[PDB]
Amino acid sequence: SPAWTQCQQLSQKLCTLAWSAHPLVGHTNDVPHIQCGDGCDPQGLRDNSQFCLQRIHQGLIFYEKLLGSDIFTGEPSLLPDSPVGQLHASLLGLSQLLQPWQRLLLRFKILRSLQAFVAVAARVFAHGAATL
Amino acid sequence: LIWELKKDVYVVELDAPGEMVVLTCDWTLDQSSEVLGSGKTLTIQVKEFGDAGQYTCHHSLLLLHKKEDGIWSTDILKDQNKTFLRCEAKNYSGRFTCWWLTTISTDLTFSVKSSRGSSDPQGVTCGAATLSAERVEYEYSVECQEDSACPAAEESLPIEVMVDAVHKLKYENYTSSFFIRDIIKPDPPKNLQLKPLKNSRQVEVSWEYPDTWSTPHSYFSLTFCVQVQGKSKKKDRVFTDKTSATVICRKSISVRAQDRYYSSSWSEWASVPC
Amino acid sequence: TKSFCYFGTWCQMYG
Ligand SMILES: *[C@@H]1O[C@H](CO)[C@@H](O[C@@H]2O[C@H](CO)[C@@H](O)[C@H](O)[C@H]2NC(C)=O)[C@H](O)[C@H]1NC(C)=O
Structure with a gap:
């Protein structure tokens, strides 16, 4: 099975990194979500965790490609001291362990969405470490 | 029409x-x-x-x-910008509560409908809106429950809340959109105990997860903020995933909770004096 | 927008 605690440590770090990249509280789905039937719930994890992890991997690869795209590598350019840079590296790191300007509004949408995805994945790996 | x-x-x-x-x-x-x-x-x-x-x-x-100057009437409910409905969830069960405020006492009727999504909306069952509080201003509240909830999933369609407000012959309607995860406020930590340590100022603080919080805790984890504060306003905060911490007592200890993996709302503080 | 410590896990690690 995967390195549960290393995934636990990394997925948790993704949560704090996704937070710092967008520390904003409040309130056409073109990203993969960890849906109800992707088997990432406590029961689905015991029964068959490989299914859940193949979904986490799909989503991780997806956000890597979004973060390395013109949305983030375009005007207005990111600061060098950016959490988004760290965040891109971390998504790649976890996926490897598994095996009015338009661009501004898009970053917010993707990072807010990313925050929801990484929170479920972080919970998966924390439970996995504690029970597998 | x-x-x-x-x-x-x-x-x-x-x-x-x-x-x-x-x-x-x-x-x-x-x-x-x-x-x-x-x-x-x-x-x-x-x-x-x-x-x-x-x-x-x-x-x-x-x-x-x-409709005055091309904008529907919103007199029945008072603004808590353009926020007339406030909603909260104690956990990820699909169960939530919404509250609104008014100055009106009688000849008032509220109808509450909810659903997940707007196109092919998924069923949410709401109860009756009932007066819950009076302040020196009336507060009404409703309890809704998602029919086929999935606590662990990453929501992509928001819950939609629709409230019909009728004061005598004035009809108005209100709406609210949210993901449960965005309206999460845990209950406070429970059974907050204090253990003085022999010949020392430090105390072992211990508490438990709130009863209403999503299970298992090993999956739906909380982060706790342990705080030591005196009478007049330093900040003495510690953050932990453990259900105990050791702090310095002078001559008050508070603990509050938030979801560990997503920055939702902080809980109300639980407290014990030193 | 909030302070980074607003997210307790962030504060636990980086505060
Ligand atoms: C909230 O109020 C609006 C405005 O009165 C309602 O819109 C009308 O709804 C009827 C029935 O669905 C339609 O035939 C009309 O075309 C709508 N009017 C307009 C101006 O579009 C709306 O239905 C109400 N919402 C709820 C939850 O009842």
Whole structure:
């Protein structure tokens, strides 16, 4: 099975990194979500965790490609001291362990969405470490 | 135009020119015996609240959805910007509560409907809106539950809350959109104990997860903030995933909770004096 | 927008 605690440590770090990249509280789905039937719930994890992890991997690869795209590598350019840079590296790191300007509004949408995805994945790996 | 709200109840939308309304009998208004018209149907020019009410042939309620300067009326509910509905969830069960405020005491009716998504909406069952508090201002509250909830999933369609507000002959409606995860506020930590350590100022603080919080805790984890604070306003905060911490007691300890993996709302503080 | 410590896990690690 995967390195549960290393995934636990990394997925948790993704949560704090996704937070710092967008520390904003409040309130056409073109990203993969960890849906109800992707088997990432406590029961689905015991029964068959490989299914859940193949979904986490799909989503991780997806956000890597979004973060390395013109949305983030375009005007207005990111600061060098950016959490988004760290965040891109971390998504790649976890996926490897598994095996009015338009661009501004898009970053917010993707990072807010990313925050929801990484929170479920972080919970998966924390439970996995504690029970597998 | 006009539309049905409930059987024999109609909403007349208006912006004095007035809207012509044709009332078909299956005529007098409210209490009065004064006959206002002859014929199976009745043409009324609805321009004001006086031209509204229960019209009866020899049986039919008309409520108004007024519009001043091209913007629907929002008088019934007071703004808690343009936030008339406030919603919260204690966990990820699909169960939530919504609250609103008013200055009105009587002849008030609230209908509450909810769903997940707008196109092919998934069922959410709401209960009755009931008066829950009075302050020196009336507070009403409703409890909704997602029919086929999935606590662990990453929500992509928001829950939609719709509240019909009727004060006498004034009709208004309110709406709220949210993901459960965005309206999460855990209950406070429970059984907050303090253990003084022999010949020392440090105490072992211990508490438990709240009873209403999502299970298992090993999956739905919380982060706790342990705080030591004196009488007058330093900040002595510690953050932990453990259900205990050791702190320095002088001559108050507070603990609050937030979801460990997503920055939702902080809980109310649980406290114990030093 | 909030302070980074607003997210307790962030504060636990980086505060
Ligand atoms: C909230 O109020 C609006 C405005 O009165 C309602 O919109 C009308 O609804 C009827 C029935 O669905 C339609 O035939 C009309 O075309 C709508 N009017 C406009 C101006 O579009 C709306 O239905 C209400 N919402 C709820 C939850 O009842």
